[model samples]
Target: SRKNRMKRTVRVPAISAKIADIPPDEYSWRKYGQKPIKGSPHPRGYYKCSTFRGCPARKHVERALDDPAMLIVTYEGEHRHNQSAMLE
Candidate 1:
């Protein structure tokens, strides 16, 4: 690779009130960590991709009470292996 691309992910809601829990068997996401959020009522959830060994993908999501509402879903860490090279 010529460049080390630092990628970030923003999970946007397609439906007005849709949940992002549509997980398939391909992705084995685990909640390995949780953080305390002072700005929001709901605590933060830290998820890490555990299917493959070299995958350092992680995300910290904090659901804010925008109830009439906006949720703050921010994804961190690098991409889950550049360009689907991790196909087992």
Candidate 2:
């Protein structure tokens, strides 16, 4: 929990390909949580990046309103280690 932590968000087509949040090509992502949400009829998704062994970055999968054919991906924590960054 710090100010330096950055977040990444994106919206991609709900096509069968590229289904996982933040694309599994960039990081070793693993799907851990997929729970039904109250706001949207769809379920809330959660993914953990295992690229660097317990990194703080996570994916928040949100569905697009009125357009179920799209997915809104969000990163909710620090992803500094993968690219190399300092606390400064």
Candidate 3:
């Protein structure tokens, strides 16, 4: 069942920027998990922005040692706590 979990993910394009090189002050993040991947020796880290306290958002950060520029990120879930309201 574990294999199926990973395969069930949608194939999203690389829309994430290089977060590792970005300054902390530019953006805020909260660490969730940092674990070693099964197939790779690298440790994958997970973080969610501290902005919008009620926002339900999370980001996965991973870097392929072979290609330092290749940063893979997976975004999960949604945010139902948005403070914005539309009134016309």
Candidate 4:
């Protein structure tokens, strides 16, 4: 059944910004873990939505290899609820 199968994901492209300046999304998030990627100096920060129980939405923040000031934000999974603001 479609309900039982994995839902098609809606992901945002990697957003570039400073680590401290990543904009907040409509859904609340919880930081679950942090790990260092191979060949990358900065560690990746993992997070999941805290607003809904069992919400599968997740995102990771990583710094650009060539630019320490540049942070990349990538979102995964579909949001179960509506967002007041979503960037293009």
RMSD of 3: 7.3
Model 3 — TM-score against the truth?
A: 0.52
The list of candidate 1 runs beyond 4 A from truth reads 1-26, 68-71, 81-88
> C-alpha displacement of 53 in model 3, angstroms?
2.1
- Give the Å error, residue 28, model 3: 1.3
lDDT of 4: 0.60
lDDT of each: 0.55, 0.63, 0.55, 0.60
User: What lDDT tens digits, residue by residue, belong to model 2 across residues 1-88?
Assistant: 6374446555664556645433444556678768997856788777776666557776767776756656677776766455442211
Collision pairs in model 2? none
On lDDT, the leading prediction is 2
lDDT of 1 by residue, 1-88 (tens): 5443334434446654556533333555677667676755576777766666677656655554655234454555554553353364
Lowest-scoring 10 consecutive residues by lDDT in candidate 3? 3-12
* Candidate 1 local lDDT, residue 15: 55
Indicate the worst ten consecutive residues by lDDT in candidate 1: 3-12
Give the runs in model 4 whose Cα sits over 4 Å from its true position: 1-23, 83-88
Candidate 1 whole-model C-alpha lDDT, 0 to 1 = 0.55
lDDT of each residue in 49-87, candidate 3, tens digit only: 555556566777777566665556566655344334221
Q: What clash pairs does model 1 have? A: 66-69
Off by over 4 Å in 3: 1-26, 79-88
